[PDB]
């Protein structure tokens, strides 16, 4: 119950990297 | 509309001690200085409490 915020931060960071895949190279 | 006076008087004292008025051509601002990243906190905000959205934690 206490380690859900860091897991949420990792999930939103993974979603941000999936959105970073739109940029392509570099 | 209020017209700017243009000239302003400031008091200057000499080395002897005599005081007189420097007349300075001075105009005022017209546009707010919004290009600064720092926020003063004093600006009129927009009300959005009447809008209905999909917030299930709020009321209709």
């Amino acid at each position: 119950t206490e380690g859900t915020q860091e897991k949420l931060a990792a999930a939103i960071q993974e979603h941000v990297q999936d959105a970073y895949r739109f940029s392509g190279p570099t | 509309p209020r017209r700017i006076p243009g000239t302003t008087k400031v008091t200057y004292t000499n080395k002897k001690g005599r005081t007189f008025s420097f007349s300075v051509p001075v105009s005022e601002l017209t546009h707010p200085q919004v290009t600064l990243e720092s926020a003063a906190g004093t600006w009129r905000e927009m009300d959005t409490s009447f809008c209905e959205l999909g917030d299930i934690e709020d009321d209709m």
Partner: protein
């Protein structure tokens, strides 16, 4: 977290190239991992929502912008008011397009941004006031009293009328049974030189008649002419006696409501303005942002025919053109 300049660089590209859902995903999830969204970040998101006319999304961005205590500029209010005019509305056959636009007071957010524009010191543009009048007037909405007072102060500030605003505001006054306000709108657009209305100029048949609000004020407080001040005469007509004319005025009162209570059997409860009036902005049909097109109806399907852009059994680059 990568470079925040790289975070802004992808936000610049998605508002410039792709649709509105990309900037809403990037700025929201980027705010949750810790990217400090500045005014440069919110103006790119608000450019993309103003283009596609996402009225619910503009309210959600301005709620997050006020929570982050970032002050909007004059370019920010330029996207809020012009974005409410580009909202989807209208009626398919019996299907209301964007029925949740009515419960949102998107006409009021466009009016609230106009009040906050002059209160904070910025200068509003001529396309803000023409787009704010459209949101009160569009066929899902019947607000011609507030749109009249907005147009009254628009002429006092010497704004020029947009031809899209005159097309919407004429159809709203005709639908709401106001021919004096509609004949004066055509008379005003012909004198100001609005394009498309220089040939339509109507005579003022209400030249001697007073205002409608002045009659209701006089009726609450010559007494034979006070009760019949609203009655319109040709000049070659005379009133009846006061007991006979008052019995005739109640005859026309019960006869007008008897005709207006009868439904037209193939209208789905709609005026003829509402029939076949589906609206999407200009982005839905192979076009992008232009400043002079405030609330631009998407061009018809006869503009681009298939099999003249690409031959048979070959793909064309129009995925969502013919889909209304």
């Amino acid at each position: 977290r990568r470079d925040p300049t790289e975070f802004l660089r992808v936000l610049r590209r998605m508002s410039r190239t792709t649709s509105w859902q990309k900037t809403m995903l990037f700025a929201s999830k980027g705010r949750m991992v810790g990217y400090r969204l500045t005014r440069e970040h919110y103006n790119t998101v608000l450019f993309s929502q103003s283009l596609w006319g996402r009225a619910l999304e503009i309210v959600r961005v301005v709620r997050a912008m006020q929570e982050d205590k970032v002050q909007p500029n004059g370019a920010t209010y330029y996207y809020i008011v012009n974005g409410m005019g580009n909202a989807d509305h209208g009626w398919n056959y019996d299907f209301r397009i964007n029925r949740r636009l009515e419960k949102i007071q998107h006409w009021r957010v466009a009016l609230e941004a106009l009040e906050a524009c002059e209160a904070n010191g910025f200068d509003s543009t001529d396309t803000m006031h023409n787009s704010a009048l459209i949101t009160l007037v569009i066929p899902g909405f019947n607000r011609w009293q507030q749109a009249s007072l907005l147009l009254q102060r628009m002429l006092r500030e010497d704004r020029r009328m947009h031809p899209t605003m005159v097309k919407f505001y004429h159809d709203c006054l005709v639908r709401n049974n106001r021919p004096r306000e509609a004949s004066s709108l055509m008379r005003l657009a012909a004198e100001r030189g609005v394009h498309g209305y220089e040939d339509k100029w109507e005579a003022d048949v209400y030249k001697g008649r007073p205002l409608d609000s002045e009659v209701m004020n006089e009726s609450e407080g010559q007494a034979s002419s006070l009760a019949f001040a609203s009655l319109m005469l040709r000049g070659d007509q005379r009133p009846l006696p006061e007991n006979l004319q008052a019995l005739l005025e109640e005859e026309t009162t019960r006869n007008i409501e008897a005709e207006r209570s009868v439904p037209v059997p193939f209208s789905a409860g709609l005026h003829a303005t509402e029939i076949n009036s589906v609206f999407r902005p200009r982005v839905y049909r192979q076009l992008w942002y232009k400043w002079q097109h405030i609330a631009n109806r998407y061009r018809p399907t006869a503009a681009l025919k298939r099999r003249q852009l690409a031959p048979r059994d070959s793909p064309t680059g129009i995925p969502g053109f013919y889909r209304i």
